[PDB]
RNA sequence: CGCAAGACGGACCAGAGCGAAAGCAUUUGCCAAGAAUGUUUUCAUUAAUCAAGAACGAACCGACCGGCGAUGCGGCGGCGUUAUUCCCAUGACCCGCCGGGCAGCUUC
């Protein structure tokens, strides 16, 4: 068990050399919640002295390094925060994902089925009776999952998020979720027997 | 030379806007005999009077 | 609510 | 002064690649991948790799007058994610914690425009 | 010996921005510059291409406006032939409270075709020094949305 | 619905109403006389005109056709008539 | 072309400059050389910084100045009158030698046709054209009431002095990158 | 770095538009067709619904009078802004009004 080092200023003085940016776009719908929790966001970035920029005009979330900031890999995770709040994730669950052991994925799910109507109902089928098979796919992968418009985003762990995309991505491809579910179920108490664990689990798997 | 392009300037744009205000007091306005005039000022775009919108 | 309801190349600039 | 190099970080979920060429990015200076550092395979993307090949890669570019890098980060992209994976973060810093000057930040995963 | 360093030295492609190239201009425009001769330890550039970072691209184009595109082949005074690609997008009026700000398609033909023209004539009369000298504060894209403000109003016009 | 008498409309209500939904049919256009520049002969132009009409005088172009009423040529003078 | 292309606090900013004298073209016959006024040959104004040629002294050293033809930014406030497009220009002129003497420390000197610019030993002269003048002297208002477009002797000589000949040089400099030896025919057959 | 091949046409993209339905999305040229609107043009009952027959064809209830908002096209009128017309073009915004549409919310 390895625990990566943290990283300080001691670590590097004026590390950083030249300024990189990223600008992300939000609709309108999100543009008043973004108001309020603008003076808590530049808080949070402060932090690690890379500054943001809310742009009404445009309807853009700007965030752009400085002078001050030394960990160069920090505007990438303030990157990715700026997506996930324009996807309409809350802030508290956006902000987590700025400590290292978070990570996350935007699936864009639109692009999959032509028919809308067929869209929209294996969307529900994803999130189930009581958004129950969501919180099933939640607790097992260890995940927060949050679906909106044809994107559905996911942040935990990194062997979670593989989990998420696989199974996001074949409910649009008309296999139902329950079968994918039912396989994890398999899959967490097979990790708990230490014997066979070198062995195939492809007959403990269900058939169809 | 710059005192004369200023003067002439100073006076050719106040020509123009007694032209401008007396056009605008103008527009619509029927005179005796019962005549309106067509202008571009109005709402409703006019033919111009060229050789080129004429041939057209 | 009461209310509710009732010099010369400066232009070139 | 200081003499740039380009570094191409590419972080999959199998494996991480770390990878330093010239401004014009034809010719090669130093490539160390996860797998030549840790005898396993479960752990040829696992950040403690990746840490490993970077401050091989990073003391390669000292004795050449290498000082500054610029970084382009690189997922799989395509029809699969656009995440870049866990020896990426690391990999990025050991580079920072071996004294390499650091360049712009920038994202070159591929993206396609029209689904297959 | 019987291979010359200088032929694999030529040709190369390096992808420089602006901001680099000129001590204030922007930092979103790159441009392309390929070795073309070699003069003891010096080599020797030439403009090659030019383009817009991605973030750029992805932060103009909106959800509530037409996006009015073109392409021309033009070929300059001393033979350099060329393409460019512009992009516009329609503006929203201060006083105007429709939500939509929508260009009819003859309307995006009329200033699809304006577009063309500007290219056509700004390079063809002009050589490639020349060119590139309109390329820097982007000169051809403040032309093209003063023409087209008739038709419909334009912002976020460039090469 | 507010009240209103079939029998005897109001002002401002049968000007305002469609030309066939009217009590009785009454079209919206009209008859002009038009005085054209360079010769002060007079012409007589309908409003609603489909085809450029040219003074017989000396065959300038008076009026161009469009979607809705005719657009007259600059500097042209107009009454209605009747 | 390239202190025009950059220069700061003109109301409208440079769009084009093009070259129209044979010598930009490799085809004067007797190229220039740059040149230093001596003092005492000649007597001083003191109130321009401009020489004048003295009547003991043989002829001076001829100089013939380079016409430029400069384009501005298009705009819409330009004046709809002929007369005053001509003070228009004759203020841009002014102001582009004011500046270009602030910016760069070069002698300039305004004239209401031309400014006349002193660099590295040779004379520029530079000429400010308006893009919709040509079309504005051709405005002809007929008798009979109907105003028309017809073209013009001095609408002729517009043309062809700021649009046709700038094309011809840039045209000819680029044959002479291809045939080297075009200077010295063309040179040789006005001699 | 360059070349070749097979698909596909994102973001812009809307409960918007078009077609009898099934269905329809890069640029440009060409051919025929069409809805609505405008009309003091023309004919004068030439119409409606339909078994048979013919063309095409993915892979609560009822013609139940109305109203209010937006929306797409066409037309009319208008205080003001905004560009401006060699050719090409006469528009962008705001307000009121009349029609036929795509849909909502209400009523009788
Ligand atoms: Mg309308
Ligand atoms: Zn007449």
């Known amino acids: 068990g390895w625990k990566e080092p943290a990283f300080s200023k001691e670590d590097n003085p004026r590390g950083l050399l030249e300024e990189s940016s990223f600008a992300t776009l939000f609709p309108k719908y999100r543009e008043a919640y973004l108001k309020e929790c603008w003076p808590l966001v530049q808080k949070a970035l402060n932090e690690h002295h890379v500054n943001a920029t809310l742009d009404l005009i445009e309807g853009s979330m700007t965030v752009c390094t400085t002078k001050k900031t030394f960990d160069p890999y920090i505007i990438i995770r303030a990157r990715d925060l700026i997506k996930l709040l324009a996807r309409s994730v809350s802030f508290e669950q956006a902000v987590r994902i700025l400590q290292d052991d978070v990570a996350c994925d935007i699936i864009k799910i639109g692009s999959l089925v032509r028919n809308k109507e067929r869209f929209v109902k294996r969307r529900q089928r994803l999130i189930g009776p009581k958004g129950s098979t969501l919180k099933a796919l939640e607790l097992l992968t260890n995940c927060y999952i949050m679906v909106q418009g044809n994107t559905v985003s996911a942040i935990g762990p990194f062997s979670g998020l593989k989990e998420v995309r696989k199974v996001v991505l074949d409910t649009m491809k008309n296999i139902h979720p329950i079968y994918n579910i039912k396989s994890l179920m398999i899959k967490r108490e097979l990790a708990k027997d230490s014997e066979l664990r070198s062995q195939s689990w492809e007959r403990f798997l269900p058939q169809f | 030379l710059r005192v004369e392009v200023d003067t002439f300037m100073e006076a050719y744009d106040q020509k123009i806007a007694e032209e401008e205000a007396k056009a605008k007091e103008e527009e619509g306005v029927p005179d005796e005999e019962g005549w309106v005039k067509v202008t571009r000022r109005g709402r409703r775009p006019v033919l111009p009077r060229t050789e080129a919108a004429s041939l057209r | ?13 | 002064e200081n003499v740039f190099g380009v570094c191409h970080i590419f972080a999959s979920f199998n494996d991480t690649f770390v990878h330093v060429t010239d401004l014009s990015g034809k010719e090669t200076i130093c490539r160390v991948t996860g797998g030549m550092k840790v005898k396993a395979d479960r752990d040829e993307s696992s950040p403690y790799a990746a840490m490993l090949a970077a401050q091989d890669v990073a003391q390669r570019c000292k004795e050449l007058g290498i000082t500054a890098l610029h970084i382009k980060l690189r997922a799989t992209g395509g029809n699969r994610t656009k995440t870049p994976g866990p020896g990426a973060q690391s990999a990025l810093r050991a580079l920072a914690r071996s004294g390499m000057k650091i360049g712009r930040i920038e994202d070159v995963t591929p993206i396609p425009s029209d689904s297959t | 010996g019987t291979k010359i360093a200088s032929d694999g030295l030529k040709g190369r492609v390096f992808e420089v921005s602006l901001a680099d190239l000129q001590n204030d201009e922007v930092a979103f425009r790159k441009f392309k510059l390929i070795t073309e001769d070699v003069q003891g330890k010096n080599c020797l550039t030439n403009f090659h291409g030019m383009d817009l970072t991605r973030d750029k691209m992805c932060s103009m184009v909106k959800k509530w406006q037409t996006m009015i595109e073109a392409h021309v082949d033009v070929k300059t005074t001393d033979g350099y032939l060329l393409r460019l690609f512009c992009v516009g997008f329609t503006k929203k009026r201060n006083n105007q409270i429709r939500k939509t700000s929508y260009a009819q398609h003859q309307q995006v033909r009329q200033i699809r075709k304006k577009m063309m023209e500007i290219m056509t004539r700004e390079v063809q009369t002009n050589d490639l020094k020349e060119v590139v000298n309109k390329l820097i504060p982007d000169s051809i894209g403040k032309d093209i949305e003063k023409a087209c403000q008739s038709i419909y109003p334009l912002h976020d016009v460039f090469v | 619905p507010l009240a209103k008498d079939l029998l005897h409309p109001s002002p401002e209500e049968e000007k305002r109403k469609h030309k066939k939904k009217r009590l009785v049919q009454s079209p919206n256009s009209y008859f002009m006389d038009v005085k054209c520049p360079g010769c002060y002969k007079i012409t007589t132009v309908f409003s609603h005109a489909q085809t450029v009409v040219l003074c017989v005088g000396c065959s300038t172009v008076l009026c161009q056709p469009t979607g809705g009423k005719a657009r007259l040529t600059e500097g042209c003078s107009f009454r209605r008539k009747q | 072309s390239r202190l025009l292309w950059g220069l700061e606090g003109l109301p409208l900013t440079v769009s084009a400059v093009q070259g129209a004298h044979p010598v930009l073209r490799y085809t004067e016959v007797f190229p220039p050389t740059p040149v230093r006024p001596a003092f005492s040959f000649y007597e001083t104004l003191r109130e321009r910084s401009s020489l004048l040629p003295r009547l003991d002294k043989p002829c001076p050293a001829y100089v013939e100045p380079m016409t430029v033809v400069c384009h501005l930014e298009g705009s819409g406030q330009w004046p709809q009158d002929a007369e005053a497009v001509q003070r228009v220009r004759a203020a841009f002129q002014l102001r582009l030698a004011e500046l270009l003497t602030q910016q760069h420390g070069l002698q300039c000197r305004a004239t209401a046709t031309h400014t006349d610019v002193l660099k590295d030993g040779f004379v520029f002269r530079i000429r400010v054209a308006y893009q919709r003048e040509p079309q504005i002297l051709k405005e002809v208002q007929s008798p009979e009431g109907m105003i028309s477009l017809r073209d013009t002797a001095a609408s002729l000589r517009l043309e062809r002095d700021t649009r046709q000949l700038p094309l011809l040089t840039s045209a000819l400099h680029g044959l002479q990158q291809q045939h080297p030896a075009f200077s010295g025919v063309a040179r040789l057959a006005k001699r």
């Open chain 3, 1 to 13: 609510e009461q209310i509710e309801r009732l010099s010369a190349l400066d232009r070139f600039v």
